[PDB]
Symmetry: D2
Subunit: 419 residues, 4 copies
C-alpha cells in the first residue's frame, strides 16, 4: 500500500524532472573534473538509511505547552502510517524506532502493520523516566540507580519486557536513556548511584539476546538539574566497557555541554570500539531536539566526516546505528522528519566527496589552511541533485515536501482523525 | 487562623531556644568586635520580604514527567492555604504572586482568603504561552508578537483582564513573560516581531493604573529554541525605555546565557532606573528553577551586594519587587520554598554586613585582594542565628522545616485532598 | 604590483575553462530560480571588508607565539602584505590601523597607502597595554580607571588616534579596552561605567563632523570576572548616551556561549546603533579564527540580517566591515585571503535569499518553508561568482594558489630579518 | 626566615584575643553538633597544597602583562618568595617546578629548597612553547606532532624533567601540552591521539618504580578547534592505556561551561585514576583566578567528594594537590596566601559534614535534608580553625596582614631591578 498516491508522486517528479536533469548533469561534470564519479556517490546515498522516531511523528511539546496540529496520530498505528509517508517520499527511513510504553501494542500486530507498510524496526527504547498509571514504584527519585531495590528491579523488568517486544517485531537492540540524577548537591552519592546503575544494567545485559546490542545514552542534564548518572561520554565509555562486547555508547548530538567538540567524541568512541550509534537532531541552547542541520549544518557534516574517515582508515566491524531523535513543536512533524532525513543524507553525501588522499597529505605536512579548505571543498558542494536523483530512482520524490503538500495527506488524515 | 498549631511552633522553638541564645550571643560578640550592632541587622532582616509563587506550592515537572507528591493542592485556594504555612513559619513571604488563568477565581474570594490567612498579593502574571479551553486563537506561533492581529489583540485583552483581577485583590503590577520566538532561522523576522511586541505592550501599558508597574521578563531560550523576542536584558531595557516610566525590567536569575555576570546586569538596570524586580531561584545548566542558593550561594550574595549598595547610597525610591520563581520536582514544595526564602534573607543579611567604607577605599586604591576579602568577610559570616532569631521574634519558627515536619501538615492535607497521579509533562 | 601580473594571468588562464563551466552552470540554475547571476556578481565585486594590520603578522596566545618566515618588520611591511591580499581578492581595499602598534608619520603612511592602492578604515586605540614613557599604567584600567589622571592620559591617546586618522583618510575611531575586574568587589560596577562614560564623552568632543565613534563590547578577556563594556546592552547604553556619532561595533567572538548574535545585530540596526562588524570565527571563546572556518551558517545568518536591513529600506545604514583575526598556525596572508573570501561568500548567499517568498512564509507562520528558503540560498555554491568577481577586477581566480605560485612568502622571508629579542 | 619572627609574633599577639573568642565560640557550636574542633584543627594543620613557582611572578594575558614591584626573576628569586607563603600559611611546604622556566643545577635547587624549608612536588614539562636553539618547533604539536623527530625531542625533554625531579626529591611528572588544531581537518583526531599515546608510552618507561605520570586534560587554549587531551574521558583512556603509574590530573578551570566537575572527580576516584588537582577559580574560561574567589561552594563540593572518598576507604586514592594560578592584578604572594587559605577552608568544611546523617537522607531520598546537611557544614565559618592551625604551626593568624606589616614586597623591590622605575 502507498500512503501517497503513486500518480501524484509521478506527476510531481515529472514536473521537476527537467530541472533535475540539468542540475544533476551539471554536478556530474563538475565532480568528474574533480576526479569523482557522481554515480558512485548517488549509489551510496540511496543506501544510507536513518531510523525515524515514533515520537517524532506527532507534535511535541515543552514543559510549558504543547500545540497540536490537525490530524494528530492517535497512537502507534497512526504513527506507523505517517512514517510510511516519510519512507515512501525520502526512501531514507525504512525503519522505525519504538518507545515503550508510549508505543505499547500487540507486537504481532505492529509487525503485521510494519510489513504491510514496508517498514522495519530499529532499536527499542525503554522508558523509566516517567510513571505509568498503576505503577507500583515511582521513578521520581530514579530508576535503574534508585536507592530502593524493588524500584530498580521494576526498572530492569521493564527493560526486559522491551526486549521481548523487540524480539517479536524484528528489533535487534535496546537503547537505555534515563533521567536518573539529582537536583541538589548531596541528594545523591555520585559513586554509589553509579554503582547501582551498573549493577542494574548488568542484569539487563544478562537478559540481552546474543544477536542484540545494548546502547546507553549519556546526557549532561534534564530532567536532573544538578547531576546526572550517565552525564557524558566518559561515564558512557566506562559503562559500555564494564558491561561487555554487546554494550556500546549512543551519542545524541544535543546532549553535550556548550561548545563541546562532538565530532571528537565520535572519533574517540570509534577508536575504542564503543560507538553504538547516533541520535540525530540540531540545537542552539540545550537539548532542543530541532530538525537535523537546521542550526549548525557544518557540525553535522564534521560528524559524518569522522564516520567516513573511519572507513577510509580501514576500521572494520563498524556499522553504527543511525536514528533521528527529534520533537517537532511548530511544524508538520512529517515534513520536518522528511527534511531532517534529507539533511543527514546531505551531510553524508558531502563527507563522501572529501579528497582523503589530499587531506592526508595536508595533515601530514601541517598545512592547516589547505586541510580545512579540503574539507570545505566537499561541504560547499551542493549535493541536492544527488539526493533528489537517489530518491527519484528509488521510488521517492524529487521534492518530498512539495509532493507531500501536493498530495493533501495532512488534510486527509485530519478528516480521518479526531481533532 | 493558623495553618500550623501555635503550640507546635512554641514547642519547637523552646526545644532550640538554648542553642540559639548561645549562637546569637556569640555572633553578636563577633559582630561587635567588627563594629557591627547585631540588633540593627536583625531589625532589617525581620523586614525583608520576598513574594512566593502560587505555582511553587504544587509539585512541578519537566517536559519528560511530573511526579506529584501527597496532598497536592487542587486550586488557588489550596495553594493559598499552603503559602500561609510558609509565611507563618518564615515570616518572610507575606505576599503571593498569582498566575492567570491557573489561579483565576472570584477576586472577592481571593482577597477574602488572603485576608483571613494574613497574605497579600504581589504582581500579577499573565499567561499567553499556553492555550486554554475555548480559546479563539492559538499561541502556538506567538502571542503579543504573533503575526495575526486578532491573536495579538486577544493576548492584550488577556493581560488587561489580569490587571483587572489584580486591582480587585490589591496587586500593584503585572509581570509579562511570553515564550514568543522562533525555533528555526528565517521563521521570524527579528525586527518585525519585536515591533509587533512593542506595539502590543503599548496597548497593555495604556491600561495600567497610575500606581502600577509593568514588568517585562527576558529569557534567553525555552520554549523557543532558536530566537526569543525578549531574549536578554538589552532588549528588555529597550522595551522598558520605550514603553514608559511605569515599565521596568524583571530579572529571573536562571534566564541568562552560560557564565553571564548577572550581578552586573542588576547594577546597570539600577543605574538607569529600570530594575523592576527579581525572580529568585538557582541553576547550573539552563532555567533549572531550583531552590535559591542551593547551587551557587555566592552568586546570590553578590546580587544582594549590588542591591544593598544601592540602598546604602539612597537611590530613586528604589524598591524592586522581590519574588521567588521556582518549581520543585523532587522535594516537598513547602519545605523548599521555606528554605529558599531563608537563603534569600541569608544573602541579604550577609550583604548588610559588608563594610562599605572599607570596600570603597579598597576600590579607589585598586586593592583588588582586600576588596574581594572585604566582601568575603561578610559572606563567610554564618548569619543563621540572625535569621532564626528574626523568625522567633516575629512569630515564626527557629527551624522552619523542623517545625513544619513536627506539625504533620503534609500528612494532614494529604488526608483532606484527593490523591494525585504521575504522568508526563507535555513531551507528547 | 606585489604579485607579478604574468603570474596572476597564468594562474587565471589555467583555471578559466573550469570557471566558465561552473559559472555558466550556476548561472542557469539561478536563472531557473528567478535570479540574475550577473546582478549578484556586480554587487559581490563591490563588497569590501577592511583588513587588520595586526592580522598580517603571525599571532599568538598567552602561552606562546610561533612566527613564520618573513614576518613584517613594521607597518610599512604590513601595508605591503595587505596590498597582496587586495590585489588577489580585490575585497580588501582598506586597512585598519592600531595605535601605537602602527604609529608612524601620517604623511608617509598615506603615501604608502596611495602607492599600493590601499585606503584606511577606522582607527583603533590601545589603552589595554602600556607604552614606554607613560606617566600612568593601565594595569587597573584606562578610560574607566579610578585615577582621573590615568583617564585623561587615555583620552589624550584616543584624540591622538583621531588626529592620525584625519591625516590619512580615516573617518572613524574604534574603542576597545580591557577595563574590568578579576575579583568580586574589586570594582564598583556603576562607578566604573560612569567614569568610562565621562571619558568617552570627552573623546566624542574631538570627533570631526563626518566621523563615527565605535565602542566594542566583550564579555571577558583580559578581565575575568567583570568587564565594563561587557555586552551589547551596555554598548547600546553607551552609544545612546554619547550621541549621533556614537555607535556599537559587534565582534562575533565576543559573546557568551550560545548567544544569538544575529539578533543582537538586528536589534542594534532597529535602533540605529550598528556601527560595524569585526569578523572572525570561534568555537570556545574569542578564538579569533578565520571567518567561516568553524560555523559558516552563523556567518551567513549575520549577513541575512544585514541584507534584510536594506530589504526593509533602513535609511543611512552603512555599517563598517572589518576582519579582526589572529593567525597562529597559518600564513597570515593566506588566512586573510580565504577569510575575506568567506565573508563575500556569506554575503553572496544572503543576496540569493528569495525575500518575497520568505516574507510570505513568515506571515503564514510556515516555519519549515521559511527556514528552507534561507537554506536554498545558503546551500548554493557561490564560489564561481566569487571567482568571476575577482577575475573581472584584476584579482585571482584561486587567490591562495596564485599567492603560492608567486613565491611571495619566500621572497619577503629573504628581505625581512626575524626579530631576535 | 623570609619574614622576621618578631613581626610574626607581634602580629599574632595583636590578634590572639579575638581569635581565642572566635575559636572558643566555634568550639562550643561544634561541640553541640557532636564535633571536636581540636580534631578538625589537627587535620587542617596537615593539609598541604603545592605552590607553583610560576605563581609568585605577575601573570598576564595575550594582550598584556603588568608586572608589579620586586618581580622575582629566575627560580631562586621565586623560591625565596614561595618561602614567604609557606612560612605564613604553613600550608604550602612544597613547590611545583616548570622546565625549562626553572632550569638550574639540581644540586643548587635542592640546597636552596632545604635552606628555605621547601620541598618539591611534581615536575612540569613544557612542550607548548619553543626555547632558544630548539631543533624542532612545537608550533603544530609536540608529543602528537606528525614529525617523528619532533615527537622524539618532546619525549626526551620529558625524560629530562624526570631526571631533574629525581635529583631534587620529586616523585611525579605532570604533562600538559597545547597539542590540537585550530581548524577542522587540520588534524586527524584518531591518528593524533595514537601518536600521543605512543609518545607517552616512551615517557612512561623512564618512570621510577615510585613515580607517577599525570596527564592534564583541557577543553581548549592554545588550540581553538580541537585538543588531543580535551577532557577527562580522553584522559581516562590515556591513564588506563599507559598503566598503574599513569593517572589523571584535574585542573578546575579546564572544563566546558556548566560541567559538573565534582562528578568527574568522583568518577576518576572510583576507577583509581585521580592523580591530582590543579586548584584555581574561574567564571568564563581557564581564567586561573584565586581559588574560591569566584565559586567557593563548588570548591567545597570538590572537597566533599575527596573527604567522602577517604570516609569510604577507597583504594588507589591518594591525590596530589597543587595550586595552578596566575596573578595579573594583585600581589602574587598575597593571592597565593589567600588561595591556599581558601583550599584549607573548603577542606575544613568538608570535614564537618555529618556523613552518617547525609547517608541516611540519601538512602531515603530526602533531597532537601541531604543538601541542607552539606550546607550546615559549608555555612560554618571555619576561619578560626584556619587561623589557629597557622598560629600553632609557626604561621600567622592573618597571613596577608602580617605580610603587609613586614614590608616584604618593598624589601624585594629594593633588591630586584624592575624593567623601568
Ligand atoms: O534524548 C533522549 C531524552 O533526552 C532519549 O533518547 C529519549 O528516549 C528520547 O528523546 C525520547 O524522549
Ligand atoms: O520564568 C518564567 C518562565 O521561564 C516566567 O516567570 C513564568 O511565568 C513562570 O516561571 C511560571 O511558569
Ligand atoms: O577584539 C578586540 C580585543 O578582543 C579588539 O578589537 C582589539 O583591538 C583587536 O582584537 C586587536 O587586538
Ligand atoms: O594549566 C595548564 C595550562 O592551561 C598547565 O598546567 C600549565 O603547565 C600551567 O598552567 C602553567 O602554564
Ligand atoms: Mn536521544
Ligand atoms: Mn534528548
Ligand atoms: Mn520567572
Ligand atoms: Mn523561567
Ligand atoms: Mn574586535
Ligand atoms: Mn577580540
Ligand atoms: Mn593546570
Ligand atoms: Mn590551565
Amino acid at each position: 500500500e502507498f500512503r501517497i498516491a503513486q500518480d501524484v508522486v509521478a506527476r510531481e517528479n515529472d514536473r521537476r524532472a527537467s530541472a533535475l536533469k540539468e542540475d544533476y548533469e551539471a554536478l556530474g561534470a563538475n565532480l568528474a573534473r574533480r576526479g569523482v564519479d557522481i554515480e558512485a556517490v548517488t549509489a551510496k546515498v540511496e543506501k544510507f538509511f536513518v531510523a525515524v522516531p515514533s515520537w517524532g511523528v506527532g507534535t511535541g511539546g515543552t514543559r510549558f505547552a504543547r500545540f497540536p496540529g490537525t490530524g494528530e496520530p492517535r497512537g502507534i498505528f497512526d504513527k506507523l502510517d505517517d512514517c510510511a509517508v516519510i519512507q515512501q517520499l525520502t526512501r531514507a527511513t525504512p525503519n522505525v524506532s519504538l518507545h515503550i510504553p508510549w508505543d505499547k501494542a500487540d507486537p504481532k500486530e505492529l509487525k503485521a502493520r510494519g510489513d504491510a507498510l514496508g517498514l522495519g524496526f530499529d532499536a527499542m527504547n525503554s522508558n523509566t523516566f516517567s510513571d505509568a498509571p498503576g505503577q507500583a514504584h515511582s521513578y521520581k527519585y530514579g530508576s535503574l540507580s534508585h536507592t530502593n531495590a524493588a524500584t530498580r528491579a521494576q526498572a530492569v523488568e521493564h527493560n526486559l519486557e522491551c526486549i521481548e517486544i523487540g524480539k517479536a517485531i524484528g528489533s535487534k537492540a535496546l537503547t537505555v536513556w534515563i533521567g536518573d540524577g539529582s537536583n541538589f548537591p548531596g541528594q545523591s552519592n555520585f559513586t554509589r548511584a553509579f554503582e547501582r546503575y551498573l549493577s542494574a544494567m548488568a542484569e539487563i545485559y544478562k537478559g540481552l539476546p546474543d544477536d542484540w546490542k545494548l546502547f546507553s545514552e549519556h546526557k549532561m542534564y534534564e530532567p536532573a538539574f544538578y547531576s546526572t548518572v550517565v552525564q557524558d561520554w566518559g561515564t558512557n565509555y566506562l559503562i559500555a566497557q564494564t558491561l561487555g562486547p554487546k554494550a556500546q555508547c549512543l551519542v545524541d548530538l544535543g546532549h553535550h555541554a556548550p561548545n563541546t567538540n562532538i565530532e571528537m567524541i565520535v572519533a574517540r568512541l570509534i577508536q575504542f570500539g564503543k560507538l553504538g550509534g547516533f541520535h540525530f537532531n540540531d540545537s542552539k541552547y540545550g537539548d532542543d531536539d530541532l530538525d537535523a542541520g537546521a542550526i549548525e549544518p557544518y557540525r553535522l557534516f564534521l560528524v559524518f566526516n569522522e564516520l567516513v574517515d573511519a572507513e577510509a582508515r580501514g576500521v572494520k566491524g563498524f556499522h553504527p546505528a543511525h536514528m533521528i531523535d527529534q520533537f517537532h513543536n511548530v511544524t508538520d512533524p512529517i515534513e520536518s522528519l522528511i527534511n531532517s532525513a534529507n539533511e543527514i543524507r546531505r551531510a553524508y553525501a558531502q563527507a563522501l566527496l572529501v579528497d582523503r588522499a589530499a587531506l592526508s597529505g595536508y595533515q601530514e605536512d601541517n598545512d592547516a589552511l589547505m586541510a580545512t579548505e579540503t574539507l570545505k571543498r566537499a561541504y560547499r558542494t551542493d549535493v541536492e541533485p544527488i539526493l533528489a536523483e537517489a530518491r527519484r530512482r528509488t521510488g521517492g520524490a524529487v521534492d518530498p515536501v512539495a509532493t507531500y503538500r501536493a498530495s493533501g495527506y495532512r488534510a486527509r488524515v485530519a478528516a480521518e482523525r479526531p481533532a
